Each structure stands twice: as C-alpha cells, then as structure tokens.
C-alpha cells in the first residue's frame, strides 16, 4: 500500500536552564526508527529499530550533524517568536515541526508536508503545491515574508520530492520484515453488568499493525455510533497497536449487538456477537 | 534521512 | 557582522593563542581556515552548532570549541613555524540563502 | 566535489567587459558564491547563486549559474582598474549534512589603466 516518512521536532524553552530542551523522532509509517535528545549524553542521533543500525558510520555522522544544527536553528527560533509576540523570557514556550512525504503503491511521490506550529496551534505550514505558505497570523507573515525571499519553498520542495522520497523507499526496502507488514487484529468480548438491567459489551481488537482500524458496533443492522464509547488507539509497547469500543445495552439483549472490525491485515472484516 | 538546509523563522 | 582578533600576532615556537571569532548574525556555522601562497583556503575545524565541532582538511595542531552561538575560538596549544599564516573565520546559516561571511583575517607569525 | 577556475589569470585593458569562469563536478549544490580578494587583504563577498536561480546582478557584476552544466560565469562589465584582484568561486552541498563550502584555486584578474 501506501507509505510515509515523518520527522517530529519538539523544542521547549526553558527559562533559566542553561539550554532549551529539542527532541526529534524519525517515523516509516507508524514505526518509530530514530531519535535525538539535546539532555542525553551522547549526543547523537540514535536508532530505535533494528533496521537503521545497518546505516554505517557516514549517514550516523550526517544524521548527528544536521539534527544539531536543527537544534541551533530551533534555538534562535525561540528567542525571534518570543520577539513576534513580544513576550517576556520568565515563560517557557514550544516549538513543534513536521516534515515528511507520502508515497504511493508504486513507491513514487505522492505527497509532500512541512508543518510548525508555536504554542500548540498552527503557525506556518507548506501548502500542498509546495510552493507557497499558508500564515497562521500577523506575526507568522514576517516568516512568510522571510521564507518567501529566501526561496526557501523551492529547496525544501526538493528535499520532499527527491531525497525525502529515496530514502524512505530504501528503508522500505532495507526494513522490509517489520515495514512491509500487516499484522490482523486479534479480537474477542467482555461483559460486564452495569446493574441488573443494563450492561456493557466491550469490543477488543489487539496486537495489529498498521495502526489504522474501525471498530463499529451495530444494533441488529443498524449503526450505534452516538451511543459508541470508543477510546483511542493506542501502542501495546512491542510494535502493534490496541483498541476497543463499547456500548451499555439493556440485559438480555445483547445477542441482538454485532461489533464489526474493519483492518487492512483481514482478508474480510470481522463481525463478532456476544454469546453466554 | 534528515532534511539538511534548515531556515529560521 | 563577523569579528576576528587579533588582527596580527608574532608568536615564539611553543607559545599557545587564540585566535577569537564572533558574529552577531545568530549564524550556526561558524569555521576557521588558513590560507596559504599555492595552498589556496584549507578548512582546519567547524560547527554547525553549541556542543558540537568537527574536523577540517588540516585539524592537527589546532583545537576549537562551540560552547555559544556567537563564539567560535580557535587555539594554538602550542605554536609551530609552520602555523605561520593567514587565518580566516567564516559563519553562515545553515539555511537562508547559505552564504558565507568572512572576518577580516588574523596574520600569524611564529618565530623561534 | 572540485571547483576549478579557468583561465587562472587574466589581463585586460580597461574598460573592456570581461568573463570569469567557474566549473564544478558535482551539480547537487546549495549555492555559488563569488568573492574577490586582494594581496594582503580579505575576502569581500560579490554574489551568492542558489541553486534555484539563474543569475544575480550588482553593478557591473553579474554572475549566471548553469547547474546542470556544472559552471557559473561571472561578467565585469567596463572594467575599471580597482577591479583587480583574485576573484574565487565556491559551492556548497544541498545534501549529505557536512555544510563544507568547496573553493576554486581563483582567477587573478588585473585590469590595467
């Protein structure tokens, strides 16, 4: 199917500390493979999944470099936004960025992105075209304006399209057995009694991966999603993903509820009834 | 691999 | 802009310096080079950030450190004839347009 | 990954419109940037080439770039005798994460009054 590679850069000010806090986390997918943490020892980029440590010692050297020097970029960031918005340097604020590109079936460009974001809200982000910004507000417009005379739009665009693209479809290919994966969602239910005439049927989908998945509850044929509790998808700690749904239903009727899990590692979806 | 030419805001 | 000092030195062999660079520009990349008659600019260190300093073309016999965004220092642990020279330090974005802007250069003489 | 300026020196009567020239092996570049230096002095920067654009002006310079031909060439128009000195070319890497500008060996340039 379709795949993506995204960077994720997290930068804290910290008001009286000696520097700000910049983490970065590479991902292929939904398979974290690398990371950076300006507060740790060594001070390099490191791997998370056993298929980068194949990388030798020049792309570690060239990770290393370009991670710091976008920590050093980060830094100044936050003293020019605090600028911007003309805030005092007792607060601590952040800086989120985002970059990557998606690729399709054929493994070819798709997609480009380059997100950043101040405070947790949009700031500035590349638009689809790759070739203009879209400005959160009036001080994100001096950054516009900056970017836009820089031709930063044409260089980044090149990244997206060409080396972005080429490397991801190399780990695609180098970290294949994990990458190139499906794993079907192992399913079952709980009841619980809720009192002596309601109860609650939970519908589990566990060990899957990618984490993409619908999970729908239905009342004989019909969809329950207002009265759907659903939680969020989340990571089992060894590569796979878990999630539930559940719905409170009147005792004695809960043969009349089907859960339906939908997942691409199924051949077909999967519909699973209650049964004492 | 990591995007190499990085612009401040 | 970029500032390098001093600007003309004479050193006795065995004598330590340092050669000093700051720029006020929030540049990331700063570096050293010393050029030479026939030798043209050689790289001897730089860095793309605090915490961070790598090798040039001709590293050996000086050392350098990035603790600061505005300072890039250059030291002669122990001065050398050979290390008579003229250097240069040069600082840039590592992003923008990428151009590099150099200090006015430092003139190095060492005697024994 | 190699800059080479040649012809290495160059004479000319002033007021004549003069070319520099600038090759380089490897087109995946960052930029060019042509600076000028005289004996004894520094490095003045002239004009930075990036990689997406054809050509910059200043003056009575102005410097093309020809990225998939691997060359720029730099144009002096009515020469004055102050346009002396030894004009370098440099190119820096749009990939690879080391930053490291690559300089040419220079063109001498006198221009005689």
């Known amino acids: 199917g379709s795949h993506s590679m995204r960077y994720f850069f997290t930068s804290v000010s910290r008001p009286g500390r000696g520097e700000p806090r910049f983490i970065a986390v590479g991902y292929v997918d939904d398979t974290q493979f690398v990371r950076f943490d300006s507060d740790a020892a060594s001070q390099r980029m490191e791997p998370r999944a056993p298929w980068i440590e194949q990388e030798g010692p020049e792309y570690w050297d060239g990770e290393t470099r370009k991670v710091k020097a976008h920590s050093q970029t980060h830094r100044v960031d936050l003293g020019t936004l605090r600028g911007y918005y003309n805030q005092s340097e007792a607060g601590s604020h952040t800086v989120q960025r985002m970059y990557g590109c998606d690729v399709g079936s054929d493994w070819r460009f798709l997609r480009g992105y380059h997100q950043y974001a101040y405070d947790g809200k949009d700031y500035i982000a590349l638009k689809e075209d790759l070739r203009s910004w879209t400005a959160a507000d009036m001080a994100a417009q001096t950054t516009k304006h900056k970017w836009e005379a820089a031709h930063v739009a044409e260089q980044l665009r090149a990244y997206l399209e060409g080396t972005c693209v080429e490397w991801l479809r190399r780990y695609l290919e180098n970290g294949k057995e994990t990458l190139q994966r499906t794993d079907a969602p192992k399913t079952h239910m709980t009841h619980h009694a809720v009192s002596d005439h309601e109860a609650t049927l939970r519908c589990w989908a566990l060990s899957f991966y990618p984490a993409e998945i619908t999970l729908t509850w239905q009342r004989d044929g019909e969809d329950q999603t207002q009265d759907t509790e659903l939680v969020e998808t989340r990571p089992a700690g060894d590569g796979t993903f878990q999630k539930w749904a559940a719905v409170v239903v009147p005792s004695g009727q809960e043969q009349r509820y089907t859960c339906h899990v939908q997942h691409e590692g199924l051949p077909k979806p999967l519909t699973l009834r209650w049964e004492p | 691999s990591l995007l190499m030419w990085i612009t401040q805001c | 802009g970029v500032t390098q000092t001093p600007k003309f030195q004479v050193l006795k062999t065995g004598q330590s310096m340092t050669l000093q660079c700051a720029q006020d520009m929030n540049h990331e990349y700063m570096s050293w080079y010393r050029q030479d008659p026939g030798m043209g600019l050689r790289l001897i260190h730089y860095?793309?950030?605090?915490?961070?300093?790598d090798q040039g073309e001709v590293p050996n016999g000086y050392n350098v450190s990035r603790s600061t965004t505005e300072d890039f220092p250059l030291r002669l642990l122990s001065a050398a004839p050979s290390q008579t020279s003229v250097y240069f330090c040069?600082?840039?974005?590592?992003?923008?347009?990428?151009?590099?802007?150099f200090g006015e250069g430092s003139r190095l003489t060492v005697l024994e | 990954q190699e800059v080479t300026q040649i012809p290495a020196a160059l004479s000319v009567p002033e007021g004549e419109n003069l070319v520099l020239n600038c090759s380089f092996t490897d087109s995946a570049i960052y930029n060019l940037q042509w600076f000028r230096q005289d004996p004894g002095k520094g490095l003045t920067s002239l004009l930075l080439?990036?990689?997406?654009?054809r050509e910059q002006t200043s003056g009575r310079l102005n410097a093309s770039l020809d990225k998939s031909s691997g060359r720029s060439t730099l144009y002096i128009a009515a020469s004055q005798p102050g346009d002396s000195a030894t004009y370098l070319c440099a190119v820096r890497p749009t990939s690879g994460g080391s930053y490291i500008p690559t300089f040419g060996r220079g063109t001498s340039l006198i221009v005689h009054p």
């Open positions: 040069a600082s840039s974005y590592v992003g923008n347009t990428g151009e590099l802007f």
């Open positions: 080439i990036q990689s997406s654009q």
């Open positions: 860095s793309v950030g605090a915490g961070i300093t």
